[model samples]
Target chain A: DKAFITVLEMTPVLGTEIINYRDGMGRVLAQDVYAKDNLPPFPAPIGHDIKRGECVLAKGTHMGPSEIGLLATVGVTEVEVNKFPVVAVMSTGNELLNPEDDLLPGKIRDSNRSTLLATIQEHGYPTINLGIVGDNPDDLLNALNEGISRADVIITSGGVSMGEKDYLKQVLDIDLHAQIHFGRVFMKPGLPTTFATLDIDGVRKIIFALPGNPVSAVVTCNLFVVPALRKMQGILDPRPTIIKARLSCDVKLDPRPEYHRCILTWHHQEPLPWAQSTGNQMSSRLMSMRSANGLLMLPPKTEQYVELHKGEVVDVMVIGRL
Target chain B: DKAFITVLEMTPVLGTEIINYRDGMGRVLAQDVYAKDNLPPFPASVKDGYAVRAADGPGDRFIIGESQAGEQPTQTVMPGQVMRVTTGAPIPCGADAVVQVEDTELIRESDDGTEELEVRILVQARPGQDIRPIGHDIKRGECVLAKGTHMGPSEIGLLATVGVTEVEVNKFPVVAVMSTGNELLNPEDDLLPGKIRDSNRSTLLATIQEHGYPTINLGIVGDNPDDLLNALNEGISRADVIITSGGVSMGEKDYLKQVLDIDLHAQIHFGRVFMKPGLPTTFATLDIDGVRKIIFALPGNPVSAVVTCNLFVVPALRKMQGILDPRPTIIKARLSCDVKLDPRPEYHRCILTWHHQEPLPWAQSTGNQMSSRLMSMRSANGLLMLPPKTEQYVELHKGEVVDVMVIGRL
Candidate 1:
């Protein structure tokens, strides 16, 4: 069996959008929205939503006044909607240091949480900042329950292998009967072992456990968690777009295929775009992600070829437009 | 431009994101945001210099009043008179320049040393020097951003600089997609010997979603003129763009091309291309209720539909966003194996990588380039663009550099 087979839950809970009509251009109606009343009472009725595989998806009802014209007929201005998951973000780093505490005075950047929150926020999702959780299971479980009570998904950045990990694993095993999906993916510049799913008398609530390395946390979300969020939104395919690029500097190969952070600069004059390294890739250094728009795909090192130098072509997974 | 590739017109139908400046980090500016008011809307001082007419130089002048920042001085500084102007303070009327505090010596002041009655100018002050004129930093009504600026921290600062609370950017278009064939069934359907499960619509919709475009799946339409026309009209009425696969082939049941011209009356710009797997690609545009709509009728082959969408539909969609260069990045790559040439140019699906024994990258084919094998597109990151066969070149050997159109992420 392929070690990396993806198993998708039957119903993705994260859900679709139901926007206010005034702000609803270029958006699709997730369901057949019918009018609640009959011309001041004239609201519209749309007949279809939830069409699946036997149906080629739906040539869903696109937003416009004509469709809204149906709404006026039923005297209903309101439309149909779906459930949107709230992401609860917290860091398991030093509890004493706040995100704003500057260098040396209080110490530590607490950047992972802030970075994760902003990244999720940038993607147009609701987020709950859970602050820093201490090493003990006392505050940790309290925080986890707080997350479980409020949000559909939880993302904990930084390690929690102390009493928190042991107790949490037991709680997941004993209390919740959680299914620990694969722990630890075999790739470089990442940490993906801390993932699991469980029930809360509620539906599926998943938690992603990330490493303390700030860059590692950022890469982890972009690779694994974000795509799953798309699945919840009903996107048929949720894979990252990887394009071709050429290396502009010498780069070393790691034992595993590394998604090395790099900056891609496009050129109109040349056929190929240039890919430059983000300097030292030590997981701790957040500077490596500075201005990084793409992850350069680097293969494992071989005795024959351990380094790829300037003007070499490589595949690049786009993270942002530069 | 490549043989079958041409850019759509830059007639962008506009929309607004209505986002606050704080959340506009990664959105593209759809409209040219103009400055509502100039940055330094009035003439002001740049230093703690006394405001005086430059013509009156190197002479003692009466100190009229102090013009600190946030204060407006009414009394004009007449000839042989100076006003005490701190940095960023408005320049009083009748003053064309400012003399540095270092260049002047106080001649007279109150006993408390609070007000300076007279000040001596020690150096010649040039006209229009040490003072910022109105609109100097940013002119009123000037374009702070062009139509297609992707916003960043510095650009968002400019949005606030222009005094705009919100902005209008090009809205992403809603795309409607459908798969057509009497023999097609949904992917979830049980296997039947005469029918193939429809994978075209899923891949096409997925490709659109991969690029963040909104998609409407019309589902599978049978190869009938009435049904195909019905789907076409619905797509035209509801979506900005429509992509339909199947029904453009040599078979008698293929009917999308006829329905578009006969019923929808769309202007068929081009009906054919000179590339393998995409030779039957068709593009048309029609106007309904004043809103222009685009339609693409592609071949039934799974590989053909997905590849042609990237080649044709993606460019048109990008142009709708007002992007000057709508074409995807195409690069040069060495072919890993010898390729037999087809009479028509081919966009052979291939996996490109730097995983070579040497330092340079290569395009490795996905084994078979048959139109029916959707598997040919598995893990394919690029399309090896090759020219039509000629007597001089029936075959291109391995290691020969050829242009490869990038199609997917690593």
Candidate 2:
């Protein structure tokens, strides 16, 4: 036997346990679900006693509860579905308007409201529109209060910062009785974003206040809001899978920590080499971001390597986990 | 410069366009979208307020065209309280600010149908209060979604919100799935003493299929050279990519290595990765039968196949799809067992669960963390990532977090 080998004197014993748990949609049986009967419990016998060929059901004949619905057809009544709450979005800004409408002087469409609403929807949460609200405190407060009353989670954009006119922060603090998390995380684009939790009759309601800048709002939403909502949906695991890849070119970073979106490519090495970075990593510029698949985490306080050169392993946040 | 170079240098260009756009929930956008116009045309209010000048009081009101969502107010404001308004209505003409409806008291006794309220201005109106100015949300011609962007629910809504009918998205690369080995039995068939029902199809099919890629499942191939060669040819012709399990390891009947070299001019880059469970894995590519194909010959063991797929095959698939980073999201979790590993590097399989933090970090291995067992695999939510350094029977603390790959179920 090798010196590293540890002799197994005996095999380890095992036991089983059954528990009831609830997830994104509803309760999931805490054990391996198995079929107790035939998939199509009773065959559609054409005649009571006539000799007939075995007729298999058509593809869409049965509705399955799980993958392929095979188990669902086998009398499976319940399966886990993520029950994300409905959130209604409203944009309050003077500089914004709707995309479908015509543009008049000094009037911009309301992209943040629908845009944020769509983003929340993409995360698999339900959302409704409370419509757009200008910078008026009364309007902002009315919309905020209505949204707080109806939505389990709420998100707003365009005005939540340090300026005297920044009314979102004031309304949320004064009227809604919300507890704000780190008013600003140490990140870029989403630096001025704020996260808060609202308590109503002992029920916790989450709210995210993103910046007006397009990229800023999107990035902040990805970094903070998605994870918060995922947690609320009973998702115990919610991080984007990461992989280390070699850089094909030199990449630069800010002195402050930030996430720079970049395109990822596989360099066919023995253990594959991957590379990313789309020309420049500016927060305002969407051109480069369009070409990148993953975001590279550039650490703050480091200046040795501004550009990632070929064959250098870098940590990347992939869009999918497996 | 090393070899004879030609003028046609094929820049190795890889651009992604959204090929399939129907109900792509949680999927990233494969292209960039520019807004056709500015969001919100005029100065729209956030709430119901009286349109007036900033210097005017609650008693003073002017009117522009009455505006609802799509309606534009027709009357112009002239300084005194004049018209009634609701939320989402455009600011009346000649109005600089708005006095909230809450602060104003409706005096129904003295007004006509158009004008029914009166009030004393308790608070002064600001220059832009209650007015959502034009183009405040998004500017015209602004790029909303960049190419290679992951489409989340919000990103999809963003595109639809902008009235984009058809999205120019990157096409999903087709992946071909297959398996080799005479010991493999179909899932529907009965399992004998030495033969085991193939579990590779279930895990791998689910894995690749969940990514929105169409899978061409080539049934089991025996140890015969002719059978393997024929299947390879058929699979390569039908699929943009091919993945197979078993027959790559060094066994007496392992014909995969021999066939790969003989039938297809495939060059084996690495026969093994420095990871556990799948240390016997192989990576190779070839211009077989006039078609270029990349092959990931995974280990025969079920656990090894899964681990190797996550570590190697997934990256390859993402690469073909024009994705920059082909890695799954990794988060650290605590191990709950006194685990042991080989001197060589390896990726062990384990079930993950939430322990302390809200970020769900704690993880532990199943009791029978064996290569052949499917029972443990079903219960596992994640793989307990063990690094390359440790060798002996190491007792992982209950809270000592280790990295795990987390993503939506595939």
Candidate 3:
């Protein structure tokens, strides 16, 4: 996963464009942004007398809501910001059904699409829905081609495993000639996740082929895609914010390092908040990902590896606000 | 202050709206949500294995058919008989337990690979073992989420799982933001010699919107009493809360307090607060046409406007949105550097960073703690709540822990 972060760091920042200050909320500044004049102008009561041409904010600042407001205050209606990368979300599977469809034998709802769309939108990125494609080569190829033509990044779920119909990797490799960076990670839930870079019409676009499981899709998106989007937006520290927390209960280590979804709560008696697992962390169980604010990083299982007892402090990534 | 918190508590929850479940994230539920049907809807397998009767355990059983998720099995397990089931598959009608594949050995396989000829159960199965009974996760008509609960991704997912396509959420209050100062110029205007850009107006508007409140940008107004009065009138009539920065101080042109008292007949609840950088903050309320409107007259400095808005306006917005605990989340952190104490309590802007090697987060000040420097607010996620200096003028040393109120999500 750290290697994934490094790959994201190496990805080039997107081009810049002039946009309204309000629309620049999560964008990085392409050029230095300076205050046109003094903030109060003359200061208090019409003439406190501050000098003009003072640089209130520097370039490279991630435009938060306050920064946008400050830009608006400085009488700048529009700003030059790094262009936001367009993301196309698609899901592939024969058994996948739309959420509106009734449950049928050997079929499941296409939750990965909706959940991914919502999560991407929540982070202030633009996403295009390629809809659900089946396991057929033509359908998957058409979706990937359209994604390559329209989006700066392509995210797909399902069809990456060893199943007979799993054709995502083959399509990306043999058909599109895209370079597969890595197909597996030393992590739980998303070990089969794959990332690739494709050059379409001389434009380099990244593709993330995530696991089909609902929980795996959500976790990998947060851990990998969110940071990439942040980097594209010019954020300096784009990784998920990590904090230290104490485990409220004992937890067992897994063979692979796991991102255990947990709920973080503040306690008056303790110096730090305590983290409790949401219960039933199976990759297929979407319930475990619900209401989770942090992910407890559990070390990989080893000869001496054992359970982590209560009160043991560990690194927890604050993925959601408390 | 405590009085301000009390006033916020008395504030009414905003109206409600029916919106799609996807749009309910970060919204407070206006009504309780109950399960439309039992979760799982039927007895299902929690593991991939053989569905069998608990009484017929540890023996070779004849394999019937298979069931997978979203599928119903027609075969019923009789004595010494079992049916193959996948995780989340509905259990056979007569089966009371499931033996995981790990605990079973295959004795014979059908040539077509579509069916199991025989399977040996390696372990004893108990009633309801590895099987999710009907309504195991949620029962029909059971409340899944209570009213006033904040909807996050998980909550939204739960709603979707229950087939809830629409949800009722509390409406956001309408906020009108204006800056009162003769020297303030609109951001679109060229900087005049004696005029500065109106950063407060934009900053305040963005701050209000960040909390999910809809803001009516009143723009910037000069020090004229008539202009101030007109803006206040428009704000009181159009918004539930009115925020004006700059006119609360003792400047000669600071006529906001005068207009509120004389023209609008609004009661000035508190003219001053016991805090640095925002000591001159004012709170007032006006009864306009039988409707009560809260007005916050914050200090005009860029840092002051931002600080006071987070401390005051954000809580007010949360209260109106029906949040039970509207106060900012406060935690303690160790200061990375020494700091001088002020006569008034200071809300020092600081950046909080976490290192795996350290057990607690380290708080570092943004440096140059001037009230007019808006740069201090940039990249800051927390505010150090430092108490006032004592008579001895004691200063907090590095390594001392202080209460930190998180202002940003980071």
Candidate 4:
């Protein structure tokens, strides 16, 4: 049941819309796409004629850079594509400060805001920054209300833990009357990750309450938020790409399943890439994410489990540039 | 020596410029970056704790003051004195260690409930315990990133961490795309006798643009010396690279090479390569206004145009962007189905998929891998690099592993 609760299996939180072909990159097609004219009009030395109205791209096709090009080539200037879901990114905490502000003795810079905003923007989503809200019930409720009214999805980091200041889950359930699907996951670095769905009028808006730590926020965002966004964009295969890779060094397994950030490198002779950990897998260390292209899914530590030896094969989720 | 030198040896043609950190994503750094200031700027607490001298830890101490993040602590810890510090808060001047709140017991609290009166440390504290020292992560003036590094989210975050707001990155070269054939027609045109829609221009333009390079669309040109020459001249004058598909083969009307060589006086680098589906792919260089512009004359076939663009043109664009290793990433993949060997090295379009049951990615060839079949490239993310046949013809059996060049993100 825990494994089945993954974002890959979640339903679309947003609907579809018709957009121009040039603006369809990363968006999924809603209907079967046909060529208006003969592709490569003149036949090649041995090529056959492509009949007009031939199905070129099928429905639910996730448009990539080439897909857009193909559509343009077929004389398709407008197309039916899934509308982008507006995401409201908010960071909650009393001790958080904006990155531009000078570091005070008791507060830290809000790296989560900038980092999450950039990551979401890179994925081509319209994001609304709710700014930093202190640990007040009214403030948290107000922010959530604004997010629900404007965005299809709400993502807030921090205030979901058991700390005295943590009131995100309480407010979501009591004040917003949202359904908390899962409040905790059996994973390291992001064990406190939460996913919930709220019914606003006739539409169901999704809310992802991620962990507050910088590494946890980013890892959870990639794992959960990205997939949800993809699903809303009508992508059929909305899961992070999972591939087989060999570990370049030995790694210690944790009690909970670990999504260890790593840099996948290719050696000329090796058939598969060798994944090297970014060192210091601390949840608070944002540097661990530097150059991290994949997350090595290390199984939970058992009584018989000790450590994964060098050259061991494991499944890695390709989350960033490869 | 034919195999010794390939298109990978081409030099970069573009220069560099200083850009904001947000605009540096996916761009290659042109110069090494050094940190402007020490990370954290001061010793900070890694957790909510009591900042105390390590020598007086594991004992009861009076709480003298508090240190919260973003605020300076006014009081310094003295002998038998401790200060409550929040995570990321700078440690007091006289404190060298911190006792985490979980390891300390509250003996008394102030009436206002904001200040701690006394706390009993139940654990031993060592120097620098739970305290992040200044410059521990990164020292000022230290090289944080080397030149030629591809900028990604983490790289950008690190740049922000080191307070480097602006960065110098390589500029992208402008590419001009065109398609040539007497029977070629624009995508918007209705079909006529012996006429076909021009998909090569759009496909080539998209391919070039997808790689973040600026593109100029010269549209479709007919198979005549005048039309071809005019398009080439416009392309050479405006773009750093000109890409023309369909006029490089040995057809009777093929005139791209003739126009480039005789009219423009361009140097033909290589008119032929030992590869299937794209053997007639040509590369040339012409001096335009004292600047050398590269010209790639790709085959007319749709599949061939896309394949050659990825194999050759993408690398060149990357090189122009100052990427040290500009070649496409080649890795090993297992063939999902049987494949026949060709007389020349083949670049077969494939859909690279991963199955948990399989150890390596299984590459299934897109059915009907013909040069003209654009459908063969549909959903394909890689090209299987099949070696040329030798004395005895060999067919790769199902599950045979081979090198695969990844061209798209799956």
Candidate 5:
């Protein structure tokens, strides 16, 4: 009742128009996107020729050419924004080995790079490997410089810890002179993420330095990098919209608020239940993540529950991963 | 023990694969793929450039030039192959990388489709640099595609990467859809004053096709034994699976169960599940002329068929393609109206509104929530779940949310 009493002083602001049904995966805009300029400003008709406009028919005989024909018909001179080209991904570790090579002692296969590449491409952003850079400060500096030079955004995994080999912070300070933003967020399984911005060829470039562990890096990327890139892409509401669902299984929560990976399933006759605490919500385990298409949101105050009701609503983050 | 012994004797063959028109949206793969060759073979340049060797760095540029795509290279270079290659032009034998034509200084121009130029590699060049090396993407004999992957753009690209002109995908599980009952009439045919065109037929076809299955409408068969048997025989012979609406539940004219038992000798399971609107739904397997076939006998009412098809049939079709995870992602939102429970759990047809955090339910609930109501299935976005043995004031919080499966647009 006290919450309602305070409403007299609260003035409401107009809510922005959010494009609904536009969450999770590569959902396209329902409206047409007019091209601003010719894709390649130079006379370099690269890849497929801009001329051979593939015929995309409308519902009836209303079309002269496909939307692609608008590029040449309108005489566009240059294009500023298109699909982001050359996503340079760097995995920083000396212990990582090539996938094709046989497993050796003290060596782990570089699964994060490929998986991250697949995840980015799943959202229609192709990637290029800048090769793995080790823990050496100078090597990381060189990798950072090259990474900035080649791609639209730089994504690095590992080296965010306070360990002796963690030279990502030092490299940014000494070589690139990047202005680091908040180095951490109050989220579960991914608190060590760091965000920084650097001026590359006068264009402001963003860098997301993720935790070294595989699962932590993936979670950190979802928390920090995906949101940052999505914001740049003019996506207003970037985060997963949570839906309140009843918990299918019992769950315990940490004192700190957190998001745990979960798989949701609709009951045979009832609504979907957000089953939480897939074994253990650890930063190193990827098995839980593999089975999860959504994340369960647990408030910090909740400790243990006997059993979440069969038909109660719970908030779940929807996303498809590789 | 007996079932295991029979199952062990039978070896399951990989299901048939056929090309479907537009029905296979989210079906799984039946086989692996090996790409035929490299994508865009012949050192296709990504940008307009002079294809050059690494040793022939700054100057020393012999421009046996002017190469547009789709034309053969008339001039050949022995030690240093440098030609004015347009984007996507095949790099000549000796050229290791491409120097952007912008970087080259045009020294002399020839009138007859030939130009001489001095070029420089502005950036450091590595071997097989600037060229998207042959087979750089999917290599031949490599497992380029995996079984049971949902078809998407990347999957299409992978097929194209292998230069597959066409693909053999799992034939959309052919569903022989039929409606049975003396009351049912064809929706397309003229409807008599007292007769209702079978809405279940059209609804089932749309629902079945949406689940990546090809549907063959067998028209409306009456409750008569001979007519139903003919319909079943013809449908089962033509398709992999048969679905018949009505005539499954116990009544005077429940000839569907009798025919399957006497003629087809089909194995019939328990005809009911502990559920609402579609509790009497029947699932059975039939041996139609020595060929084993599966069929779902649904309630005659449109709402019952739609819900039961969603609950049971869609999963069966998905399982045909080997997808284990065939469940809908559900969330919890608030009920906008107060709802009471039935003796058993029921999926109440209700319209859901996404307001604030909760998906608010509309007040006009329970009007079309019955099994016989077709209008309920049409207007509802979700089935408002009512648990068994509850009748107290169950007002769903105004701002409380509920899980809703996005069926279609407003």
Candidate 6:
């Protein structure tokens, strides 16, 4: 709660821009949008009626196609919406290499940034890929500075653990002097997650130091970063939509609460959707993430119950494209 | 299934493009993606710990050197010596096990605090306990993503892991959208007798555009036979699909576009749907210069136009883009209150919300579900797929779980 709530509090809502109504798809309204002219213009054989100046779309309304359609019917040619937050994504590690780089003895290709980039793009946010910055202080500092100057949010993976080469915490504290909201989370796979905020000119920017593993990076990004991005864009409640579901199989619980990746399926007869765990819940197992549509929240294992069995009710955060 | 099946069968998958993997999100893979190298590429530590010999068990050990991720360690973990390793770091030579810091206590450190000198292990270690073997997650030359797989963020990550610089993906479909009404005016026009502003075209065009499809606004077409005919011809010429609202509405004007249909040699598949608010929905196909073009004539009511568009048009567009499963995702939701049933099955617009007070997701109607109410379409995410009313059951009670077709994001 402390980690999640702090990140949300530190993230300030972004400024607005007046974009064409046609271009307002997936945009968040900066202010409550009103109807300029009466729908149907005048009452006729049409069974429904809408009046002039009625509040058709409220502030913080995410303008999906339906909202876009409503705007057109009300004669709104343009709408003021929160400007798209430009996120700067970077992967931090000495072991991380570019995807195009041939396989090296000790280094692996950097993938967290690509996934992060895709995640942001999927939600329609603008992104600047900062590429890979090795674990050295100077090079990493330069990359982060570029992010601070060019974007509203900076997300980097790796170097947040308690290892010798972990330089993210020190750089944010010693060099950039950014205010770290929380240095670590209490969840599995993302225990070393870091959230920080710093000011540039008059605006505050968010920095998310996610875990390095492919699975952890994606899970943590969805858990914390995406919601903050939504909030910055004026979504009233920026939390992921969590629905109730029943387990399809028994799940082993860890000491720390876990956001278990899973494929959720809906049944016509079941009271709730069924969540089946993605095989192999290891942080390094990227395969567990592929085709996952929900994040099942499992409670920390207690002496009373170390596992949640089939047909047990649970909460699942929707992450599906379907 | 009949309505859905016809759309998929008629909609041809678009040609492919070899785009950079970075731009592949939301695009369907045109070919299978195979990994070039095993993930982890080498024996790596799954956690930040000290690489030690499993035979050493629990004991104090002298620190040899540190092995960080990306840099190969030059030292060997001889007997009682431990090489410090970070998460994802390659295991040092001769180290068959790793002990986490939580189970070990730091015993000595250099004055500079830059390096650890010694550590005491509080737990025993076993061979291959915390090491991630090469190709642990995925094997080299294994298929990472199959053809027709829709790329998400994780899919993109898989491409990176497999070193896929570029991928072949299906192209999105283009839809030509319009509204047909003699009483319709431009959305910006002032009120007039028997004339209302056209919301369907703007809404229809945006609906298709929102899904990443290119939409050409044919604007509002007049109900005159020649006028509608020319609009249909122009749409088929420039677009993959034509979606129009209002021309098929009412009794007298029902087959007004029949002459244009005959002129284009288009075959009507279904003249009507049994669903309420969308009863007038029509599906037809035309062959022009060996290329098939689809047309959906939806009801004039703004809500009906959008609902039927979601039910019929969106899936058709998705199928054209090579989506393996073009049908909308359906889930059972608890109704918030009693809903009266209609003679025909109704696609009731509602706000689907996950309420903490309720165990399952709740479907709350957007006030009136009247077909003409454009306001009902606002903020609605799901269309309650309700069955037709019978004498035995005129209405469904609150808390009754019923299937809901997802149309928009929460």
> Against the true structure, whose lDDT is highest?
6
**B267, model 2: CA deviation in Å?**
2.2
Q: Which candidate order results from sorting by TM-score in descending order?
A: 6, 4, 3, 2, 1, 5
**Residue B52 in candidate 1, Cα distance off native in Å:** 41
Candidate 1 vs candidate 6: the DockQ winner is 6
Encode model 2's per-residue lDDT on A205-231: one tens digit a residue: 666666765545655665555545544
Per-model root-mean-square deviation over C-alphas: 17.7, 14.6, 4.7, 4.2, 20.6, 3.9
Q: With candidate 3 superimposed using the best TM-score fit, by how many Å does residue A107's alpha carbon deviate from the native?
A: 5.1
Q: Model 6, which residues run further than 4 Å from truth?
A: A30-48, A51-62, A162-166, A187-190, A280-290, B1-5, B47-65, B68-88, B99-125, B189-194, B250-256, B275-279, B338-345, B369-378, B395-397
What is candidate 6's lDDT per residue for A1-322, written digit by digit as tens?
6778777777787787888876777777766666555444444533346656556656655566666666666666777877878888887666667888697677677777777777778777777777777767789888888888888788778766655546777888798988876776664444587778888679888887777666666677787887788777676778787777788888678777755678766665655667778644332333332366877777778885588788688887887654
Top of the candidates by TM-score: 6
Q: Give the TM-score, chain B only, in order for the candidates.
A: 0.65, 0.81, 0.87, 0.87, 0.70, 0.83
Q: On a 0 to 1 TM-score scale, where does candidate 4 land against the true structure?
A: 0.86
Chain A TM-score, prediction 5:
0.66
Give the fraction of reference interface contacts each candidate recovers: 0.02, 0.17, 0.36, 0.31, 0.04, 0.53
Interface DockQ per candidate:
0.03, 0.10, 0.34, 0.36, 0.03, 0.47
Whole-structure CA lDDT of model 1: 0.61
Angstrom error at residue B336, model 6: 3.1
lDDT comparison, 3 vs 5, better candidate: 3
lDDT of each: 0.61, 0.54, 0.69, 0.68, 0.52, 0.71
Better of 3 and 4 by TM-score: 4
- For model 6, how does the per-residue alpha-carbon lDDT over B306-365 read when each residue is reduced to its tens digit? 677787677777777766666677877788788787687756677777777778677887
| Better model by lDDT: candidate 3 vs candidate 4 | 3
lDDT of 2: 0.54
| lDDT of model 4, residue A259 | 61
Docking level of model 6: acceptable
Task: Return the top candidate by DockQ.
Answer: 6
